[PDB]
Every structure is written in structure tokens, then in C-alpha cells.
Amino acid sequence: LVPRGSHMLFQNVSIAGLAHIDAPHTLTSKEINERLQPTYDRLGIKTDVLGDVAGIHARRLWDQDVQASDAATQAARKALIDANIGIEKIGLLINTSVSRDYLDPSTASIVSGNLGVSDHCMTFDVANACLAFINGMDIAARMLERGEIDYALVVDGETANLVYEKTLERMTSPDVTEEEFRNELAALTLGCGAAAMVMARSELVPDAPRYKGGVTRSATEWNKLTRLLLIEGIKLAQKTFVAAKQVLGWAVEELDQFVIHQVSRPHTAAFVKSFGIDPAKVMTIFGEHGNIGPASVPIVLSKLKELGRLKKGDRIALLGIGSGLNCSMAEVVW
Amino acid sequence: LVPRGSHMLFQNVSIAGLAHIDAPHTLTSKEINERLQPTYDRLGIKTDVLGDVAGIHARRLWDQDVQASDAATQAARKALIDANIGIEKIGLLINTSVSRDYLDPSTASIVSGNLGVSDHCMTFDVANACLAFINGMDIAARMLERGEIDYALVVDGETANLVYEKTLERMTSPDVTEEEFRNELAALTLGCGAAAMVMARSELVPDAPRYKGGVTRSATEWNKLTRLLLIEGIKLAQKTFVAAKQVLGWAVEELDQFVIHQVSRPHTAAFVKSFGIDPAKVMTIFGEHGNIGPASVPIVLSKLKELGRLKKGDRIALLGIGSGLNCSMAEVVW
Ligand SMILES: C/C=C/C/C=C/CCC(=O)[C@@H](O)CC(N)=O
Ligand SMILES: C/C=C/C/C=C/CCC(=O)[C@@H](O)CC(N)=O
Ligand SMILES: [Mn+2]
Ligand SMILES: [Mn+2]
């Protein structure tokens, strides 16, 4: 009758399976810079924006014309193995990538068709820049908590190959302005890869990691979006951490890991300083994989798992700031 | 303890407000045909595919470069007035259109920023071809039923102006093949427009229309998709009507209206015949507005409302078949 923060938390929702795919091809920032050198020389700009402002030494790309749906499909096959269940158990499949095969049909339907989902499986895509995987986890959690389904897949395949190709094209053209070139460099911090998660009703999966849910705040006055964006982003995150205290009971020192969406080395450094977070609890892959958009969060969770970095009882914070602006923060208990 | 169909229905979810926008400009199929006449003459094709196979006399377009987000915003302002609430009450805003301003940020965030949502409002886009508005209604319903929010907006603005422009360009070119021209004609059954709905917890809105929820079936083996598509579509719909009997208790003769997504005159005629539905309970706008994608369903519901066509207690079926293939069917009680 009297509301409490903890009442909105999911009680009966778990993670049965989790997998990621690293894209295979390394492209170093040194190789990109050689290609860009004469637009750099031409513009009278002497700074290595990628290596030294962004802090990206390399990113991963696909070796071939891999569609979003292909990479999600591959990640989804692995997470099913990880969970030890067949595709027939899946009642819901949500695709959360920014990369998309077509405006029609949804990417989710293509992935589902690849996996051979049953006729009872509901499917759709969610789009919300870099926070969508956490939005799809939440969506599936509600259906699970209610009993509408027993098992869900949340998938995300990202591909940036064509982005890099169109981008390096404009940036190495005699024509190009500084204001333009500068906008374009940020496309070069993106990376490729994929992740998938099998979520389930906790009674069907006893002792699996528990998905508690989370909180979202927004600052859509700034949907227009530079130097400003870091500041507004931190201010939104401060307010989401308050919400997270009110619902999840978070204080920073009680969390065992922060799985953070990452934009750049300086953006991450500022976030971490501003909230007093110990950097040893912030696994980072941006410097060699780049920004994998909404897949980043689950990829980093899956890497933590693979390295045996997580223990029963570990409180794990999933968070990011995304375009909109939006900020979400959720908790897993391993 | 023993599951029953009715257990999955939402008990506490209502429609507080509903509005639509008709796009202003009429483009007749006769005017399009004059432009296409020499590709028709050239191809040795003597049939008016638009007027006589599709059954579309006209469609509506925007008079200017209206973005999806602009049309959703306008529809959303009207549905708030209809509901008599201010934007501060809104805890969730989902955008469901196929049309999209950018791959980033979500269209939802742009709409929310336009309306001036508060910092507590969660936002994201759902994409699922023509069924997404019903998917967004369901998503919001779950959050409402649980008490996470009190009010939600589900919005959808569609724009086809650029589709028509690129399409009529390829179709009137000496170059063009029949197989190509034939693919392209179907883009010419699309229309523009928008809709928005305010959903709320039923205790906050006593006596408003009730959203019970619904069912989905899929046939994602056919995500590859002609003449076949009508048949597979009917077969999927048959199976969804079974699910709807099992959950909602539907029989065809007990429903007062069918608000059906519409693809074409013959597609609709076949659906209606195959299920024995009385055509007088199928309001249709396709012949003068064309296919408004996922906005079609709410637009037709809103038109029914406006005409005073609905009575307290009326059982209203919302349905469509969408790419994937997917089929969903949900019930409103006015
Ligand atoms: C410290 C945070 C600053 C906010 C920056 C947000 C930029 C977001 C991006 O452009 C991508 O990484 C992901 C995204 N679009 O959500
Ligand atoms: C009788 C049904 C036949 C199935 C046809 C589906 C075509 C769907 C479309 O192409 C659009 O109208 C909407 C959509 N993509 O969902
Ligand atoms: Mn290689
Ligand atoms: Mn006009």
C-alpha cells in the first residue's frame, strides 16, 4: 500500500545465458591517420585527435559484408548454448541495435527467422541510441515477471564498416572543411561486434544471475546534440544516480563492478572522477574495440563473465548516457 | 494457480486520449498515372494497377518537409488536449513509426523534447513494420499495470513524400524494367498522417475506454517477403484468431468493430471473407488515404471516435498482419 523503491524491482527475472562476438579485423588508428595525413596537413591541424583526444588505439571491424542481423544471429546462437536451451523455449526476441538491415521488416524478425523461432514468439526492434540493450532487457523483464513468457532473447549486432568507408572518403577529399572534418572524426571511434542475452523466469533457472531492473532519467531539452554534451551528460547521470539510490539503494562503494557504456577516454575519465568510482571496477574495451554502441554494455558484461571476473553475490551496475539525452542505470546480482 | 486466458489481460489500463492528423494534400491515382503513362505504354502493360488492382483512388501527403517527429508531435499535442492533461504527467513516450528522422537520436526523444517532457519520462522507439503501434500500446500497458507510471504517450508520424518523389523518378525513366516497375508500384499505395494516444491507469481515469491487451503470432520463416504473401498472411491470421479466442474469448460475431491495418482493397477483401467478418464493421480509409503504415490502426480508431461511432461497452478489435510475418490482435472496450 505504501510505495517503496524496492517494489518496482523485478523479483523473478534472471539471466540464463550471455554471449558476445568480437569482430575479427583490427584497424589501428595509426593506419587511419596515414590515410588522413594530407587533409590534416592541409587543414593546419597537428593533433592526433583519435589517438590523443579520443584515446582509441584501434577498433574492430568485420572481414566481410556482415549485416546486423547476421552478427546478432551468431551472438544469439552462442547465448542459447550458454543457457543450454533450444530456440523453441523463446517467447520473445528483441533486437536493440543501432545498425539495421532494412526499414522493413524489423531486424528482429530476420534474426528470429534465422534461428527458427516458433510461431508463438513475439518480435520487434527497440531503438534508443546506446542505451537500447538495457531498454530491451527491461521490456523483456516485464513480460517475464508477469508470466506472459518463460524465456526471452535480447540481441544486438553492430556494423560500422560502411560508416568507415563513407567517412574516410569525405575526410580525404581536397574539398573538405575543418568544421566538417571535425564532425566526421567522431565516426572513427565506432567499432563492430555483437551480443545476446537469454533472460528467463528465475524459478526455471535456479541460481542464475538476477536482473533487478533500474531507472531512467532524461534531458530531452538537449536532443539538439561537443564540450557542452559532457557537462549535460554528467548532470543527467548525477540525477539518475539519485533515482538509483531511491530505487535500488545504490551507493558507489557498494557496487562491485561498473559496466559503463563508453564514448571516449576523456568522457569516461570525467564520469568516473565526477562520481568517485574506483577505475579498477570499470572494465574498458574502447581503446582496442572502439564504441560498439548499444552492444557495448552486454559485451563488457560477457567479457567479465568469460574472464571468471564475477562471483555469486556480486552487485553489478549497468549504465550509460545516450543521445536524447537519456541515462539509464540497472543492477545485476551475479 | 491454474492459468486461464483472461489472467494475462490488463485490468487497470485505459485510453485517456486519442487524436489523429490527416495529412492535407490529396494526390489522386489518376494524376500519378498520367505521369507514369509512357513507362506503362513502353512496358506494354495496359492495366491501372493502382486504381484497379490495389483499389486506391487517392492518398494524402504533407504540403511541406514534415519530419516524422513533427507529425507525431502535432498528433501528441492533440491527444493531450483530448485527455485534458499536461505533458508533466507523462512518464513514458514511445514512438512507433516506420518513418524516422535520424538513426540517432531516437525519434521519441525528439518528440519528447518538442513537447517538453519532464526528466522522469522514459523514451524510446519501437520498430515493427505496421504492427508497432499495437506493440507500443502493449509495452506501455505493462508499465501502467505494474504502477511504474501513471500516464504514457504512444505516437506515430508517417511521411511518404520522399518515397513518392524517388519512386516516381525511377518509374518514369526510359531505362526501367517490368520486374522493377512492378516492385516500385506498391510504394505508391502508401500515405501520410499521424496518430497519438494517451494511455493511463484506469483508477486515474474512471470510465475511459479500457485496453485489455492481446495476442501475437509469427511466421518469421517468411521474413524473405506477392500472391504467396496473401495466403501465408491469412494462415498466420487464422492462427492468431485461435490465440485470441484462447485469451480474449473472441468470436467474430461478438465484436462490434474491426480496426484493421490495410494493405490493399483485395488484401482486405480476402481477410474479411476468409473470417466471415461483416464489412460494415470494418471502417476503411485506404482508398483515399492509402496505407499509413503503423499509424493506420490508431487513425481509424480515432476517426471512429470522432464520428461518434463508438458506445460504452463496444468491443473493438485492433488487428493487422505486418512484415516478418507477424500478426497481432488486441481488444479495446469502449
Ligand atoms: C559523458 C557523456 C556525454 C554524453 C555523450 C553522448 C554521446 C552518445 C553517442 O553519440 C554514442 O556513443 C552513443 C549514443 N548515441 O547514445
Ligand atoms: C493479407 C495480408 C498479407 C500480408 C502483407 C503484408 C504486407 C505488409 C506491408 O508491406 C505493409 O503494409 C505493412 C508492413 N510492412 O507491415
Ligand atoms: Mn581481417
Ligand atoms: Mn496542398
Residue finishing a domain among B156, B175, B205: B205
A301 and A174 together in one domain: no
| Chain centre distance of CA A46 | 32
A162 and A264 together in one domain: no
DSSP letter (8 states) at residue A256: S
| Chain centre distance of CA B218 | 18
Contacts of B219 (CB under 8 A, 6+ apart): A119, B232, B235, B236, B324, B325, B326, B327
The CA B151 to ligand 1 mean position distance, Å, reads 28
DSSP A47-106: S-IIIIII--SEEEE-SS---HHHHHHHHHHHHHHHHT--GGGEEEEEE--S--S-SSS-
Helical pair B227-248 and B265-274, crossing angle rounded to 10 deg: 40
Max Cα separation, chain A? Answer: 68
Cα distance from N-terminal residue to C-terminal residue, chain B: 30
**How does B240-262 read in b/e, with b if 16+ C-beta sit within 10 Å?**
bbebbeebbebeeeebebbbbbb
A141 and A240 together in one domain: no
**Residue type for A129, please?**
A
Q: How many residues does chain B have?
A: 334
**Residue type for A168, please?**
L
The CA A314 to ligand 4 mean position distance, Å, reads 61
B176 and B261 together in one domain: no
What's the resolution in A? 2.1
> Beta strand B193-201 with B13-22: parallel, antiparallel or unpaired?
antiparallel
Query: Domain tally for chain A?
Result: 2
A185 and A322 together in one domain: no
Q: Three-state SS for A326?
A: strand
HEC readout, A173-194: CCCCCHHHHHHHHHHHHECCEE
A57 and A129 together in one domain: yes
Cβ-count burial of B278 within 10 angstroms (0-12 exposed, 13-18 middle, 19+ buried)? exposed
With an 8 Å Cβ cutoff, are B109 and A324 in contact?
Answer: yes
Distance, CA of B142 to CA of A92 (rounded, Å): 15
Q: What is the dihedral of CA B77, B82, B87, B92, to 10 degrees?
A: -100
Q: What is the dihedral of CA B95, B100, B105, B111, to 10 degrees?
A: -50
A140 and A210 together in one domain: no
Q: Three-state SS for A225?
A: coil
Grid cell of B260 as nine digits: 484493421
Distance, CA of B198 to CA of B93 (rounded, Å): 9
- DSSP lists the bridge partners of residue A333 as A210, A315
> Beta strand B151-158 with B193-201: parallel, antiparallel or unpaired?
antiparallel
> Beta strand A315-322 with A257-260: parallel, antiparallel or unpaired?
parallel
Q: What is the CATH number of the domain that holds B292?
A: 3.40.47.10
Picking from B18, B106, B293, B121, the residue whose alpha carbon sits closest to that of residue A104 is: B293
A128 and A214 together in one domain: no
Residue nearest to atom 1 of ligand 1 (CA): A230
Cα distance from N-terminal residue to C-terminal residue, chain A: 30
Q: How many residues does chain A have?
A: 334
Residue finishing a domain among A147, A176, A205: A205
Mutate to test the pocket of ligand 1, among B102, B103, B104 (most ligand atoms within 8 A of CB): B104
At which residue does the C-alpha cell 574492430 appear?
A60
Contacts of A82 (CB under 8 A, 6+ apart): A16, A17, A18, A19, A198
With an 8 Å Cβ cutoff, are A128 and B110 in contact?
Answer: no
Distance, CA of A218 to CA of B118 (rounded, Å): 8
Which residue range is the domain that position B247 belongs to?
A: 206-334
Distance, CA of A137 to CA of A133 (rounded, Å): 6
CA A108 to each of CA B55, B128, B171: distance values in angstroms, whole numbers, following the listed order: 31, 8, 31
With an 8 Å Cβ cutoff, are A8 and B147 in contact?
Answer: yes
Four-residue CA torsion sign, B230, B236, B241, B242: positive
Residue finishing a domain among A205, A233, A255: A205
A40 and A138 together in one domain: yes
A79 and A93 together in one domain: yes
Q: Does residue A121 contact residue A90 with C-beta atoms inside 8 Å?
A: yes
Peptide bond into B325 cis (omega under 30): yes
HEC readout, chain B: CCCCHHHHCCCCEEEEEEEEEECCEEEEHHHHHHHHHHHHHHHCCCCCHHHHHHCCCEEEECCCCCCHHHHHHHHHHHHHHHHCCCHHHEEEEEECCCCCCCCCCCHHHHHHHHHCCCCCCEEEEEECHHHHHHHHHHHHHHHHHHCCCCEEEEEEEECCHHHHHHHHHHHCCCCCCHHHHHHHHHHHHECCEEEEEEEEEHHHCCCCCEEEEEEEEECHHHCCCCHHHHHHHHHHHHHHHHHHHHHHCCCHHHCCEEEECCCCHHHHHHHHHHCCCCHHHCCCCHHHHCECHHHHHHHHHHHHHHCCCCCCCCEEEEEEEECCCEEEEEEEEC
B224 and B193 together in one domain: no
Experimental method: X-ray
> What phi and psi values does residue B32 have, to the nearest 5 degrees?
-55, -40
Mutate to test the pocket of ligand 2, among B184, B258, B323, B328 (most ligand atoms within 8 A of CB): B323
- DSSP lists the bridge partners of residue A320 as A328
Picking from A212, A265, A260, A211, the residue whose alpha carbon sits closest to that of residue A237 is: A260
B230 and B298 together in one domain: yes
Q: Does residue B69 contact residue B188 with C-beta atoms inside 8 Å?
A: no
> What phi and psi values does residue A65 have, to the nearest 5 degrees?
-80, 70
